[PDB]
Ligand binder design. Structure first.
Ligand code: CA
Ligand code: CA
Ligand code: CA
Ligand code: CA
Ligand code: CA
Ligand code: CA
Lengths: 181, 164, 164, 164, 164, 181
């Protein structure tokens, strides 16, 4: 071969990363300790917006991706109080992150909402958006979070209640990037 | 057409029965089942004139300690004009249940499937499928927090705005 | 499924433009078409979450003395964020109409057939199919009472109760 | 291919004819239909080179007091170079209309279905399908505001950017 | 319908990097790809409300002597709100390229095919498919005249005139 | 059913996360700018220990895993200097992280080492350990890093050289956890 003025660049494998990871797992999105007698009807025990940052192991994975799509979402309310406590709880998943209404009727309207006594556990199988949602935050949060889990006291509680909200997320990240805080 | 079909669960009544005030025959919840009581169906019927119940299944959640003493009986009179609030009416009707204060039961009632009206009238016989009664069988020991959740599925028609 | 197909007519706005102030380019009815404006859809949106406008048609119904010698132009900008109130912007939009103050007209615009959100929010392009603008083209000799009726056919979905 | 089929409505002209000067044979709206006049087609012609008018229909929309006792005649001469402004020339052309000042009318002319040029040039017979002429047939007692709306369906081709 | 399909090449940005001012990490072109930047598509989107990118292929032509020392790296973030302007973001994304200052490369990016809006909004996430970044890897020796030409092919809809 | 003193816990899906992700990609491990005349024989241009922290997108993924195994490792030296510069470079991968020797012979001994002129690019296909390595640091680094890449100036450089070391890693993380800094 001859000697050129400047040789051509030989970078072949650039910008060819993997664009599909089906990360999944289970994590605790909220832990609450209700003092006795403060579980008044309508009190908001848990108000958690489902974002990749909220889920611990999903936050780092979404930091290196642009868009994620929730493939399977399920919640499991697991109170740890004894069986001699009186009162009820309601758990639901509002599919609109901007909604700020916190009433029993609002949760009861949504599909998959559960009402139970504090000495009994329930699973909230919700209705979420299957579309692609951006990992990073923005002006409108409806493109970033599938919804918000809300857990209220239906009735006045007698003893101290230690509730724990668990989430079984299953996402499919795509559009590789190196998103930064 | 205008056959809007709606369904969902809604708490018709939340009641707090105090401890030691559970004399037998005391009525905890005496509710005429009109669409106004149901929150979502209340908003739905405020913009409609006629509805027709297609599936009605009440379910009772009392939040009480498992060691409480007492019981509840529930029934659904298919006649809204009935004013009898005794155990006899409940035990006569179909789908009535009786249970302890910590148990959850479903009152699967016998309701009418005709087209009723979403607004008040001279007679309730064309405005509501019936009346739910919950009575306190036996004397309660602790405080009772009962909530009656109604699984309803109606079909609305004749669009028209209404004011309560 | 959970979809309900509702339809009806509503008066989004009614304005009394005084005589002599009907200068060209003066906004008369500048309304944003959200479910709140339509009363029946206002009640029906409170019990749902996401709607899609399947059919939208406006009617200008001025009520003026025949001596009035002015005109109006009506249009439906499919961009809620648009703040342009000029004649050309209206006329370019599909279905825009120009008429005299003594002739009712119909506007058949090009609504976006996407699933919007019933509730309000930070971005209006996801909550409103558009906004109607009516301009008084010519000076009117008499006071003109203009009413902008609307005919809508939405498809609600994702049942959920909400608050104003 | 490179062809795009656009359509819309536009106000080619709007004229305030004062009371008393509505003599017969007085030109009111004498406009040449080039893409410049139509705003949306004005923007769309700057990104193309050759267009063909597939459908062209005008609407006269006068806004006058009912006391006005004059009339108008509207026509579309398919020759841009024509400088004749007489009643017979208008009436002979296909689609010409005669009406009173309180009746909107539609003109459906015979446009030439050939591929013209979006840009201007030395000969106007290759750049404009024609020209609209409106004459005030009778004397008007009141001031008349006349608006000439246009409905066009062009087929642009030969993509290229241009300058005004 | 109104599915106007357009395509063609257009220079998004012409930049003149001075000699000896090529510190590593210096951003030469940081352009949010809205239709306004593209000349022909700018005119096209001034008469439309929604567009949907169907084929996007940037190509870089630097006019430099073959003996110049330095290099350029180019990438396309599919998120317009991203403000990171470092080599890490480019090397992370798909289709990014790095080359010498005399070479021409095509940045075949990963873009969204949804229907965006042709006008500004609160969020850029519905107005532009992404953001192109060109960084100066290494220190330039001579003066650099870089031009980024965008092969675009979009589909517009919802006719409406707009003013920038 | 009867009413027990205390009901049994119903947490079923606990500690059942995914233990296999084949994360892969390419990243720049070092960027150097050598001033003219300072490329003396033996000068250490690049001395990079291959750890999950060094690789940007791999750091977050290894933060949520215990052990990783390098399935495919390849380096690509890509100088950006013109074709009129004189001098050479040597690139190699020492498979022993504790080794601190920095000489031309040490690199030349290892398999896959490359010697070239500065106006020409080379790929370093090294010999690495296929065994499982812990993600987190410890007392002995030989259980955490496959090796160390070293890039030296073979001869004196004439002009300014801007070298860039790229790595094509391909790991297989396992043993899920939530390792913390
Ligand atoms: Ca982002
Ligand atoms: Ca009524
Ligand atoms: Ca909402
Ligand atoms: Ca031309
Ligand atoms: Ca707009
Ligand atoms: Ca560890």
């Amino acid at each position: 071969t001859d000697a050129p003025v400047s040789k051509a660049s030989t970078v072949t494998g650039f910008g060819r990363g993997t664009n599909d990871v089906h990360l999944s797992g289970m994590s605790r999105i909220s832990q609450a300790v209700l003092p006795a007698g403060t579980g008044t009807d309508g009190y908001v025990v848990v108000d958690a917006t489902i974002v990749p940052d909220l889920l611990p192991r999903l936050g780092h994975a979404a930091r290196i991706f642009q868009r994620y799509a929730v493939e399977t979402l399920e919640f499991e309310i697991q109170p740890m109080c004894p069986a001699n406590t009186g009162g009820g709880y309601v758990a639901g998943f509002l599919p609109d992150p901007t909604d700020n209404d916190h009433t029993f009727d609002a949760l009861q309207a949504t599909r998959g909402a559960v009402v139970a006594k504090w000495w009994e556990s329930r699973t909230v199988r919700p209705q979420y958006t299957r579309t692609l949602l951006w990992t990073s935050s923005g002006k409108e949060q409806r493109l970033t979070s599938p919804g918000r889990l809300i857990l209220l006291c239906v009735g006045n509680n007698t003893d101290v209640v230690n509730v724990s909200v668990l989430c079984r997320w299953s996402v499919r990240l795509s559009v590789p990037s190196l998103e930064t805080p």
